[PDB]
Design a protein around this ligand. Structure first.
Ligand SMILES: CC(=O)N[C@@H]1[C@@H](O)[C@H](O)[C@@H](CO)O[C@@H]1O
Ligand SMILES: CC(=O)N[C@@H]1[C@@H](O)[C@H](O)[C@@H](CO)O[C@@H]1O
Lengths: 165, 165
C-alpha cells in the first residue's frame, strides 16, 4: 500500500519525510533525491517564479532562487511563498488554503480563520439556502446545511453549490 | 479508504486540508473542528508547552499560547516551534528532522542538508562499512550501500545499523 504522492492520492508524509518517486515515505537519497515528490527533498523541489507559480509541499518556504526549504535562506529575504518571515497580504486569495483575515493578512488559527475570515479555510462560513444564496469562496462546496467546506460532508450528498459530487 | 491521521497511517492531507476525527481530508467544521488531527484545524491543535512538547503537524507554527497556526501571531514573537521567524541554533538536534547545517542552524534544502550537514534529513551522510563504521544520527538506519536514512530502503534488507527491522 502506497503512502504518499501521486500513488497515494497526494498524501504527504509526516515530520518532513520525503516521498520517494515510488510513493513511499523516508529519508536519504532514495526518498529525498531524484524523483522526490514532497517533504524535505534534496535539493528542494522547484517553486515560485521559477516553476510556474507552484507552491512548496508541506508548507516549506520557497527561496528567492525557487527551491523549497527552511531557514533564513528560504523563508527570509526574497522568500516567494510558504511561511515567509514577511507578513503576507491578501484580499488575491492566500496560497494553499490559508485564511485571509478580516485585516487582510494570510494565516491559520482563529485570528485568521475565525470571526471576520474573508477566504481560505475559514472556520464557519454560511452559504446556500441558509444564507440567502451566498456562494462559497475558493471554489469550496456548500454543504446541505449551509456551511462552506470540502470533502464528502460538503461536496457529497446535499451539496448546494461549488464543485459538488 | 482513509486518507490521513491515525486511521490513514499518519499521513497528512495536501494543501493544509484538515484531517477529520475519522481520518478524511476536507475543510469546514466537520474536518477542522472538534477532533481535527492535522491541517488547518480551527482552533489550531495544541502544541509545545501545552501539548507535552508535541510539534504542530504540517510544519505549522506553535504560538506562545500553544496553538498551531501561521502568521506573525504564530510564527513571530513567542513562537515555540515550527518555522518560527527566529533562527534556530543546533550542533543538539533540530526538531522535526530538520537538517543541522555545517554552521549550526536548522533548516531544509541543500545549504542545510548538503555538504557539512551534521544531523537531521541530510542529503548524503555516509555510514557503515563504507564509512569505517560511522553511526547515523537521529536513530536513522544505515542502508546497505552506506547512506543514512529512514524507510524500507534503509531499515529493511541490508540495514547495517540503527533500528533495523
Ligand atoms: C489576524 C491578522 O490579520 N493579524 C495581522 C498580523 O498578522 C500582522 O502581522 C499585523 C501587521 O501589522 O496586522 C494584523 O494584526
Ligand atoms: C546554512 C546556515 O546555517 N545558515 C545560517 C542562517 O540560516 C542563519 O540565519 C545565520 C544567522 O546568523 O547563520 C547562518 O548563516
Amino acid at each position: 500500500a502506497y503512502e504518499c504522492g501521486k500513488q497515494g492520492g497526494g498524501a504527504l508524509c509526516p515530520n518532513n519525510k520525503c516521498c520517494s518517486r515510488y510513493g513511499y515515505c523516508g529519508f536519504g537519497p532514495a526518498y529525498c533525491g531524484t524523483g522526490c515528490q514532497s517533504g524535505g527533498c534534496c535539493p528542494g523541489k522547484r517553486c515560485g517564479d521559477q516553476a510556474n507559480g507552484e507552491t512548496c509541499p508541506n508548507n516549506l518556504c520557497c527561496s528567492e532562487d525557487g527551491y523549497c526549504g527552511f531557514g533564513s535562506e528560504y523563508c527570509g529575504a526574497g522568500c516567494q511563498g510558504g511561511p515567509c518571515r514577511a507578513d503576507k497580504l491578501c484580499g488575491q486569495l492566500c496560497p494553499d488554503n490559508l485564511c485571509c483575515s478580516q485585516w487582510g493578512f494570510c494565516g491559520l488559527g482563529v485570528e485568521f480563520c475565525g470571526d471576520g475570515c474573508q477566504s481560505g479555510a475559514c472556520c464557519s462560513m454560511r452559504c446556500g439556502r441558509q444564507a440567502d444564496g451566498a456562494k462559497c469562496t475558493n471554489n469550496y462546496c456548500c454543504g446541505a446545511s449551509g456551511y462552506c467546506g470540502l470533502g464528502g460532508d460538503y461536496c457529497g450528498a446535499g451539496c448546494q453549490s461549488g464543485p459538488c459530487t
